[PDB]
Amino acid sequence: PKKRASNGRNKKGRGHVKPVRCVNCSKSIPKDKAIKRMAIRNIVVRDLSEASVYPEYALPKTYNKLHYCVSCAIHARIVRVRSREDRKNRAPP
């Protein structure tokens, strides 16, 4: 029997959604089902500022959206397989 009412993820009423390709194994996966996590990490960070001109003018970072193929997400990223009723919780934390 089914073990998720969505039986996949976030898709009701369209029949099809062109897929994305996971970052780890390059395996394709429908966009609605690919698990997405936005990586926002800075460049860091104490001596990069002293022996430097521009005494900490901007401090920009890397912004990039990540999609996993889920099995790879399960391997390393946040899947952290849940229990029967605990998986229904959609809280991000």
Binding site: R21, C22, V23, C25, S26, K27, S28, A39, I43, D47, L48, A51, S52, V53, Y54, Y57, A58, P60, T62, N64, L66, C69
Partner: protein, 127 residues
Amino acid sequence: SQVFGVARIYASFNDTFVHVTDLSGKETIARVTGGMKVKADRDESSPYAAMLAAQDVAAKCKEVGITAVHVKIRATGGTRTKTPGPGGQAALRALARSGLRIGRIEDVTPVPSDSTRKKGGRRGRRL
């Protein structure tokens, strides 16, 4: 406040690249970092080696003389992993601390509008 150039850094998995050059980019000053002082063929991306080679990089930088440049660092990109590598930051870590100023920083990683379908087929690498 002093003379500038261009950083031109690149980060991969199992390799790293770092190289200075004239702002115009026409003339290249000193580039090689990747597996120069490290030779295992596995530690090419390693941060210890990235710094050990970044040392000789800033070395030549001042060997002919320049005070600073702001980065143009990027990841392989294209259609492969969209993200910085291990030996990317570990090089400028020992290069900014090498007595040289830094300024305007930005990424140059190439990214398309969802095209040029990647390798591995729809099932991707299988392991």
